A paper describes a structure:
Efforts towards the discovery of selective and drug-like inhibitors of the galectin family of proteins have escalated during the last decade as a consequence of an increasing awareness of the important roles of galectins in e.g., cell adhesion, tumor growth and metastasis, inflammation, and immune regulation. Galectins may dimerize (e.g., galectin-1, 2, and 7), oligomerize (galectin-3), or have two ligand-binding sites within one polypeptide sequence (galectins-4, 6, 8, 9, and 12).
In order to understand the structural basis for the affinities and selectivities of compounds 14 and 19, the structures of their complexes with galectin-3 were determined with X-ray crystallography. Compounds 14 and 19 were soluble at 20 mg/mL, which allowed for co-crystallizations to be performed to generate crystals that diffracted down to 1.5 and 1.4 Å resolution, respectively, with 14 and 19. Furthermore, the naphthyl moieties of 14 and 19 indeed bound the pocket perpendicularly above the β-face of the galactoside site, which provides an explanation for the high galectin-3 selectivity of 14 and 19 as this pocket is unique to galectin-3. The coumaryl moiety of 14 is similarly positioned between the R144 side chain and the S3 β-strand, which is different from that observed for earlier coumaryl-derivatized galactosides in which R144 is aligned along the protein surface and below the coumaryl moiety. This is most probably caused by the interaction of the coumarin fluorine atoms of 14 forming multipolar C–F···H–N, C–F···C=O, and C-F···H–Cα interactions. The closest interactions are with the Cα of G238 (3.0 Å) and with ND2 of N160 (3.2 Å). In addition, longer fluorine-amide carbonyl interactions with residues R144, I145, and S237 are present (3.6–3.9 Å). Interestingly, the amide NH of both 14 and 19 formed a hydrogen bond to a water molecule short-cutting a salt-bridge between R162 and E184. Furthermore, the hydrogen bond network with R162, E184, the water molecule, and 14 or 19 extends via the ligand amide oxygen to accept a hydrogen bond from the galactose HO2. While the coumarin 14 bound four-fold weaker to galectin-3 than 19, it displayed a better selectivity over the other galectins evaluated, as 19 also inhibited galectin-4C (C-terminal domain) with low µM affinity.
Numbering used by the authors: 113 to 250
Write the structure that this text describes.
């Protein structure tokens, strides 16, 4: 129901206690999904489910500074399934983004970009039907 890629403004950036919720459905033959929490051209937090990286499924997380990708953080727990509805929740904590999918904790990503209040856009891209993208303070 939403156009992909989708740009969700985060007015005044993010802050601890901010909860971002993404609802959608993975497409049948999916290859990749991405959520990009952006500070201008920088990507503070790139969350990238990969359905076929050397014939394994993995989540790659990273940061892009001055157009250069940094050290990737991988996690092999992979809760997405092609063709299935998902909920990603990203809770901003003091020292990390905390990600839960379908109400189960998945991973944490320490803040490399420190200017939380300047991470003012979330890009949602890839092989999904996007249902909703929203935020709230908890
Ligand atoms: O390309 C790979 N690695 C280099 C880069 O790694 C970065 C993280 O360190 C980024 O993931 C970068 O991708 C950027 C990107 C992703 C993207 C996406 F995920 C979408 F769903 C849609 C559009 C996208 O456009 C992009 O530029 C990506 O190009 C890559 C390598 C090896 C693989 F097996 C891959 C499998 C799936 C996807 C990417 C790869
Ligand atoms: Cl910074
Ligand atoms: Cl909202």
């Amino acid at each position: 129901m939403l156009i992909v890629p989708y740009n969700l403004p985060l007015p005044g950036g993010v802050v601890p206690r901010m909860l971002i919720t993404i609802l959608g459905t993975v497409k049948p033959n999916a290859n990749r999904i991405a959520l990009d929490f952006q500070r201008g051209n920088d990507v503070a937090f790139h969350f990238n489910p990969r359905f076929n990286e050397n014939n394994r499924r993995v989540i790659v997380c990273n940061t892009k500074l001055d157009n250069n990708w940094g050290r990737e953080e991988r996690q092999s727990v992979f809760p997405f399934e092609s063709g299935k509805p998902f909920k990603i929740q990203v809770l901003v904590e003091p020292d990390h983004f905390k990600v839960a999918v379908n109400d189960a904790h998945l991973l944490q990503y320490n803040h490399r970009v420190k200017k939380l209040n300047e991470i003012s856009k979330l890009g949602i891209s890839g092989d999904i039907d996007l249902t909703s993208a929203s935020y709230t303070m908890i």
